[PDB]
């Protein structure tokens with residue numbers, strides 16, 4: 222009674238194909254509960270989940286296509302600019318998902334590509350070193366905290382010159398909030414350590430070598446929290462940037478119909494519910510109940526209007542323009558060094 226909306230013609234064509242090839246940036250052990258639940262709904266589809274770096278998904282999909290090859294049926298990546306680039310250059314199958322009827326216009330590239338998540342950039346901190354009542358929830362507050370000599374060497378954030386997703390998050394921050402400029406000069410004052418990888422930043426927070434990290438995903442934070450009780454999460458109340466992992470179907474899928482079923486599943490309440498609950502990835506669908514959900518995010522930040530979703534839109538391709546990147550990175554490098 223929670224099966225996704227399904228074209229019966231699409232289900233029947235997927236019975237015949239019997240195969241689904243995914244290229245995904247989402248760790249298989251996060252995706253596993255979705256793949257297993259999907260296989261239980263459509264036990265007649267054999268799935269090949271390829272768990273890849275976001276740059277590799279792009280480089281690989283572009284070669285197989287250009288060499289004329291059988292490539293993925295479905296592409297699922299947190300690299301929003303690369304997905305929106307492919308989907309706006311002839312790589313995407315147009316499909317109107319029946320589970321996406323209430324997606325906002327800024328969560329879908331028309332019928333080319335869909336948001337599957339709404340993941341906040343948050344603050345994480347080590348409760349042994351910073352109590353919750355002293356962790357500020359505004360950029361101005363963080364900039365003040367980072368003047369304190371006890372915080373020198375105790376801050377982590379992204380290196381937006383080595384992490385594509387860190388670029389996207391810090392750039393959205395810089396474009397939307399003037400107080401980001403104050404904060405970035407404070408990263409400089411505090412000698413912030415910059416990380417290309419969430420894992421290496423968290424390791425240092427958990428050890429107490431950093432006390433606080435800025436701009437990492439809520440989904441990852443919650444996942445680490447489940448096993449690490451010293452890990453605190455604070456949500457920004459002056460304004461929160463959110464990432465949307467983007468899914469689209471290969472225009473040239475050998476199994477377009479199996480990809481349609483999987484895409485519909487990912488967007489369905491059943492799939493988004495299971496994602497929130499098992500993977501602790503923050504859902505896109507507003508009707509999901511639990512901690513990793515739009516409703517929970519909106520209450521934590523003090524209202525929906527305090528979340529700026531990075532849109533599933535060609536507008537974000539300005540992030541790939543050399544002069545646009547340059548202005549941000551020159552401000553960034555002057556501020557944090």
Ligand SMILES: O=S([O-])[O-]
Pocket residue numbers: 256257268269270
């Ligand atoms: O779930 S694994 O077998 O693709």
Ligand SMILES: O=S([O-])[O-]
Pocket residue numbers: 383416417418
């Ligand atoms: O770029 S490495 O840190 O994933």
Ligand SMILES: O=S([O-])[O-]
Pocket residue numbers: 384417418419420
């Ligand atoms: O690439 S993420 O793990 O920082």
Ligand SMILES: O=S([O-])[O-]
Pocket residue numbers: 452453454455
């Ligand atoms: O208190 S925990 O949500 O950081």
